Design a protein around this ligand. Structure first.
Ligand SMILES: Nc1nc2c(ncn2[C@@H]2O[C@H](COP(=O)(O)OP(=O)(O)NP(=O)(O)O)[C@@H](O)[C@H]2O)c(=O)[nH]1
Ligand SMILES: [Mg+2]
Ligand SMILES: [Zn+2]
Lengths: 136, 122, 209, 176, 38, 338
RNA sequence: GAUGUCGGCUCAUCACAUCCUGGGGCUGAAGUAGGUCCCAAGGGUAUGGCUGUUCGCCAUUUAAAGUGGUACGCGAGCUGGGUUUAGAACGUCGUGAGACAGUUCGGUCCCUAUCUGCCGUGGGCGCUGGAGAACUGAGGGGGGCUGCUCCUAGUACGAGA
RNA sequence: GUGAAGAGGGAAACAACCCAGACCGCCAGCUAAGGUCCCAAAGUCAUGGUUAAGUGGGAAACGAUGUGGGAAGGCCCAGACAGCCAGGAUGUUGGCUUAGAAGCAGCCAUCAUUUAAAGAAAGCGUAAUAGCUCACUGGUCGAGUCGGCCUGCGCGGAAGAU
């Protein structure tokens, strides 16, 4: 359900997923979740992972969301001829490049964070990895 | 022979007078029933004061066959009119108390002694 | 042990002591004579060639006449080969009787069935005859469809349609023998055997249990 | 590999001969012959047996250890012998030994007859007890497995044939 | 026994073995941990 | 097997079929119309009353019973098949209470009775059922109504003909040994049995009766703090209530007070059990080797103040077991009201 | 530039994501009977009322009355039952002619097989002198279904059922 | 850029893919892509490795003591790990609640004694006593063992109809 309340424009182009990621350095926590491959991250996956992490950590520690969809996706309804204008928006996704940090954890031990990220990787449609905070 | 959709009489005093053979039991793709067999019948007309009514469906046992019965010595037992004995659905027990008409000896072979015992003929 | 070769003259029922009728087939068997004996050294397999009946001298030509004279056997109606049982041995020229079937109690009969000529699809493969009414036109005993659409694009081998029936070897297995006569040379086998009256029949011991 | 690093020593009264890749450990408890893999070499030496691989083979010591274990089994089989223990639990379970023939009755509709190998002997000191004597562990193990497969016990009542040292699972099941 | 793509040691007494080129798990404690399709 | 009540089962009614939005196109008719078959009716869960069954051990594991999903409506006006009915075997005498606003839907009366617990979901109508002048190309789909997810509690009433009540010191469990062969736990410690068990005394093929042993209670079990008085509920259906008094108990050493203490909780459970014609017999007679056995048994009879016919039986082996069974089944014959 | 469409009859073939039969594993598998999963396509896999119906509901059997492909198999094999050219009527729209993925009645289904394909039967030649017979078998083809009862045994199991 | 409007060679066949733009003839040689086991012309060429799956010669999330290489870490002959032989209580059935809570149905503190070691304590079982383990320690054995990362090549995941 993570979706901007107001948008300047209703529709967006298809776009591309070239280049490298920007948010690769951890700046809010100690243990971070980083993507390994390109893909599309729907909002539903985001709140599913957030709920899974809340269930795994027994509601202790702090949770940071480093990604927001900010991009709509249009799907044509069934049995509709091509054209006749662009379709309406159904769900919003976030485009990320490899190396983008997804989630960052604090107040958790190493093994708990590792098992939580292992559980999260299943809901993630792309390969993830475990990283830790490094000075500067 | 006896097959489905066959007009059949009664050999017992249960209360029915004419019964309709519409299904023959014994196995898949069962075509005909011999002299001793289990068949499914429907009542077409019966005495209003009899033990059975109109439209009831129950199991019956053949007693006489128009075509005949093949004896081991090349003998055929023809009959004039085909009848059956009314039996309960859950248990193979005769409903009528008496049997009117000839009965073949083959019914004894397949362990049907109730009809044989109370039969005033063969 | 080997079987015999005989001719069918008819079939008749047999009355038992309890009154049960047993329809059996009457086959006359002539005293067969061994014409050749085969071995591993020469032909690579063991078998014996026998003949039955008699044939007219004028009809018998020089090749088979010399073949018979080599074995010291007179003319015969035909020649047949029987395989041995890995230990049974036969000599050339000895006669074969019929009482040896007093213990097999189960025989196999092979012969040429009655020729029905060119038979239709309904008679050959026991097909289902189409409706003769309800608008049907010129299609009653026709086979009908013989394949699918252009995707296979051909008719598969072994498809069932009209052909020539009979006049071929037919084997009937597990036939019970009732009585055998030595002085009259008759064999009584329960059941029906293929072929017509007077046709040559080959009787062999049952191979199954 | 590391298991083969300890040479095995045959006891007295046992003769060992080598005819290539065939080994014989015949002696007091019978004669047996086993073929090798054509890859591990045994060297004639003092009263001990050593094992070594051939250069150019990936397995080498991995199968040399297997060969060492097999020779260790066969030497004690031909010097001390191999004993297998089997017992019957449950009513209607009868067993006996007559010569080289054993009969089993496990509630079947017909007696069960099993044929023992030449170098395997069986005895029945107790009516519900069968002891197997042999010179090779593999043969007696196969015989015991064949006997067990007929009436493998269930975890409800434990009825069937079983080994002495084995343990079965007991389940408290109640339904239907 | 269960056949599934993912095979893991459910308990401490689950031994991973390779039989006939496939991954199998044998549990000496109790046979509910038997898996295939490794 | 053993008689255990309070069985819980959860059942879901079959979900209705799902319609499909399809249009018919033929060789010469590009505009055929909406051609989508309706879904199939969801499966309906059923139950049967079984005279033979007398226990709920088959529902102790809280098995989930699933009714098959109604076949989804296929194209070209193909209606999906309705789901097959699911039937659960239920004994006679059970009442069912739901979880949350629970109520008794029905009580078992006779074998073969059918009761509806959850009705299957309705089928999903296709596009063929909503065409009109206003809309000629229906693209909407109607999902089938979901099935009824309900929790069922199965409670079973004891069907035994003879009920047993006595202190754990009495050989109530070993009394089954002399009268039948059921093999419950028998030992020299109090509260040997934790659940009531069943048993049948078939002395003759024509006539037999069912006797059940019930775990004993303690002096304080009336108020609670032990097993409670909940096992007294498995009564009021047995024709006779057999009672055993343990003569000269090793740990009791007070036959006068423990004989009358049985009636204390008996008179205060719910209605004193309507004062059913209970009997009074003794046990452990083989312990007393000679004439000394019966005068003290007669002496304790006057303490109760009942003065009716009494039996001297030893549960170890025989000694009045054979003829007491005849007297028990005799009382069964004259009274056919259960 | 054309009968060619759906369903039904006859004829079947192939795949297993297996309905039964067959071999098992686990089980919240006492037994019979059940749930799940694996291998296995050799065989078999219903009769009637309603509707044209494929699909379905109902009644009664069986081990089941499997899922799909083959121009949603097969109309130069059959049927014309649905829709449907020309007629007419009902309800709606349009002043109207007329129309209606709204409903009812009736309403032409051709072809003598050229080739490949298949089923059977023949002529020539060859197999190295010719001819008459009898056989081995490289290969190919046909079938591979099971219900019930009894003995085991009312035995094991099971408190009894 | 190609075809349209370009022939030929290769991709098994395959306008649009790669090389290559055919004036004609020659029984001459040298090359591009692609190949040199044969069909079908050319290395069964040389050097050093990987692969056991026919991967080559179609496929993903995930799983796995498959295997090779690399940088590292803990324990290591003041004897490294796994096996084997033994020990593994003392107040103390800890208190309460409890028919039965003696460690392993419920809560609590969880400190404290002689030891190379013993926790009112994790698992099996007994209603509970029993009876088996575990943590831990001793001795023999004797040289690598344990678990984290990257990378190449491998396996399962992988079932359709002539
Ligand atoms: N010699 C003898 N000993 C008896 C006799 N009846 C009982 N006992 C002994 O007394 C014990 C009584 O215990 P038990 O029968 O188990 O009691 P229970 O019927 O199980 N009662 P609960 O289930 O309430 O514990 C028996 O186990 C047995 O040792 C008897 O007739 N003779
Ligand atoms: Mg008791
Ligand atoms: Zn395990």
């Amino acid at each position: 359900m993570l979706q901007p309340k107001r948008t300047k424009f209703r529709k967006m182009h298809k776009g591309r997923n070239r280049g490298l990621a920007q948010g690769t350095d951890v700046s809010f926590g100690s243990f971070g979740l980083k993507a390994v491959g390109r893909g599309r991250l729907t909002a539903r996956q985001i709140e599913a992972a957030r709920r899974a992490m809340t269930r795994a950590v027994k509601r202790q520690g702090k949770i940071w969301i480093r990604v927001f969809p900010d991009k709509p996706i249009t799907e044509k309804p069934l049995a509709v001829r091509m054209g006749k204008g662009k379709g309406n928006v159904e769900y919003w996704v976030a485009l990320i490049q490899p190396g983008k940090v997804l989630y960052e954890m604090d107040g958790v031990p190493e093994e708990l964070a590792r098992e939580a990220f292992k559980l999260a990787a299943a809901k993630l449609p792309i390969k993830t990895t475990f990283v830790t905070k490094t000075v500067m | 022979m006896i097959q489905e959709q066959t007009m059949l009489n009664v050999a017992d005093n249960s209360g029915a007078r004419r019964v309709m053979c519409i299904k023959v039991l014994g196995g898949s793709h069962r075509r005909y029933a011999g002299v001793g067999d289990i068949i499914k019948i429907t009542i077409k007309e019966a005495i209003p004061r009899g033990k059975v009514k109109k439209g009831d469906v129950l199991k019956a046992v053949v007693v006489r066959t128009k075509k005949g019965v093949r004896r081991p010595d090349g003998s055929v037992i023809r009959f004039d009119g085909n009848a059956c004995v009314l039996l309960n659905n859950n248990s193979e027990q005769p409903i009528g108390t008496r049997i009117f008409g000839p009965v073949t000896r083959e019914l004894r072979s397949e362990k049907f002694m109730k009809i044989i015992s109370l039969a005033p003929e063969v | 042990m080997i079987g015999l070769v005989g001719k069918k003259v008819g079939m008749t029922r047999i009355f038992t002591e309890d009154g049960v009728s047993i329809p059996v087939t009457v086959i006359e068997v002539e005293a067969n004579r061994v014409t050749q004996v085969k071995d591993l050294a020469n032909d690579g397999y063991r078998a014996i060639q026998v003949t039955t009946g008699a044939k007219k001298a004028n009809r018998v030509t020089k090749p088979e006449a010399g073949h018979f004279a080599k074995a010291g056997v007179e003319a015969g109606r035909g020649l047949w080969e029987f395989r041995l049982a890995e230990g049974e041995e036969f000599t050339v020229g000895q006669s074969i009787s019929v009482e040896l079937f007093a213990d097999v109690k189960k025989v196999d009969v092979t012969g040429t069935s009655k020729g029905k000529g060119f038979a239709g699809t309904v008679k050959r493969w026991n097909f289902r005859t189409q409706d003769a009414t309800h608008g049907n036109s010129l299609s009653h005993r026709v086979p009908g469809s013989i394949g699918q659409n252009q995707t296979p694009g051909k008719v598969f081998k072994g498809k069932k349609m009209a052909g020539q029936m009979g006049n071929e070897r037919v084997t009937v297995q597990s036939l019970d023998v009732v009585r055998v006569d030595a002085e009259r040379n008759l064999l009584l086998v329960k059941g029906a055997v293929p072929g017509a009256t007077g046709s040559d029949l080959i009787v062999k011991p049952a191979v199954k249990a | 590999s590391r298991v083969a690093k300890a040479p095995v020593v045959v006891p007295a009264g046992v003769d060992v001969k080598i005819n290539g890749q065939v080994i014989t450990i015949k002696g007091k408890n019978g004669e047996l012959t086993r073929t090798l893999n054509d890859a591990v070499e045994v060297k004639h030496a003092d009263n001990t047996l050593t094992f070594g691989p051939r250069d150019g083979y990936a397995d080498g010591w991995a199968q040399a250890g297997t060969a060492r274990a097999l020779l260790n089994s066969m030497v004690i089989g031909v010097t001390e012998g191999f004993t297998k223990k089997l017992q019957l639990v449950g009513v209607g379970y009868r067993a006996a030994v007559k010569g080289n023939v054993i009969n089993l009755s496990l509630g079947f509709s017909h007696p069960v007859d099993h044929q023992l190998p030449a170098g395997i002997t069986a005895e029945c000191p107790t009516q519900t007890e069968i002891v197997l004597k042999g010179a090779d562990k593999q043969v007696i193990g196969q015989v015991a497995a064949d006997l067990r497969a007929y009436r493998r016990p269930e975890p409800y009542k434990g009825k069937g044939v079983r080994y002495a040292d084995e343990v079965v699972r007991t389940k408290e099941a109640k339904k239907k | 026994m269960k056949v599934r793509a993912s095979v893991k040691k459910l308990c401490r007494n689950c031994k991973i073995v390779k039989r006939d080129g496939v991954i199998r798990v044998i549990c000496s404690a109790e046979p509910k941990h038997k898996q295939r399709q490794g | 097997m053993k008689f255990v009540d309070e069985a819980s089962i959860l059942v879901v009614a079959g979900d209705g079929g799902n319609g499909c939005v399809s249009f018919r196109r033929e060789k010469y008719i590009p505009k055929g119309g909406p051609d989508g078959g309706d879904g199939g009716d969801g499966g309906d869960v059923w139950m049967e009353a079984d005279e033979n069954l007398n226990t709920l051990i088959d529902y102790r594991f809280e098995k989930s019973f699933r009714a098959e999903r109604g076949q989804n409506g296929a194209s070209r006006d193909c209606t999906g098949k309705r789901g097959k009915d699911v039937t659960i075997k239920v004994p006679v005498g059970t009442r069912v209470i739901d979880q949350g606003t629970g109520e008794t839907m029905g009580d078992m009366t006779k074998h073969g009775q059918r009761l509806l617990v959850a009705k299957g979901g309705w089928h999903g109508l296709g596009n063929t059922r909503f065409k009109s002048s206003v809309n000629r190309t229906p693209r909407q789909k109607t999902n089938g109504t979901p099935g009824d997810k309900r929790e069922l509690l199965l409670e079973l009433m004891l069907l035994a003909d003879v009920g047993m009540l006595g202190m754990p010191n009495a050989g109530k469990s070993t009394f089954i040994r002399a009268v039948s062969a059921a093999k419950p736990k028998v030992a020299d410690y109090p509260f040997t049995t934790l659940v009531p068990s069943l048993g049948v005394v078939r002395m003759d093929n024509e006539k037999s009766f069912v006797v059940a042993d019930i775990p004993g209670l303690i002096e304080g079990a009336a108020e609670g703090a032990g097993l409670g008085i909940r096992f007294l509920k498995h009564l009021e259906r047995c024709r006779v209530l057999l009672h055993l008094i343990d003569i000269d108990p090793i740990d009791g050493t007070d036959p006068v007070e423990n004989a009358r203490i049985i009636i204390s909780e008996l008179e205060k459970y719910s209605q004193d059990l309507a004062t059913k014609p209970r009997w009074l017999v003794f046990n452990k007679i083989d312990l007393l080797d000679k004439v000394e056995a019966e005068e003290k048994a007669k002496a304790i009879a006057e303490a109760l103040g009942w003065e009716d016919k009494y039996y001297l039986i030893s549960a170890a082996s025989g000694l009045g077991v054979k003829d007491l069974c005849w007297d028990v089944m005799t009382f069964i014959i004259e009274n056919p009201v259960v």
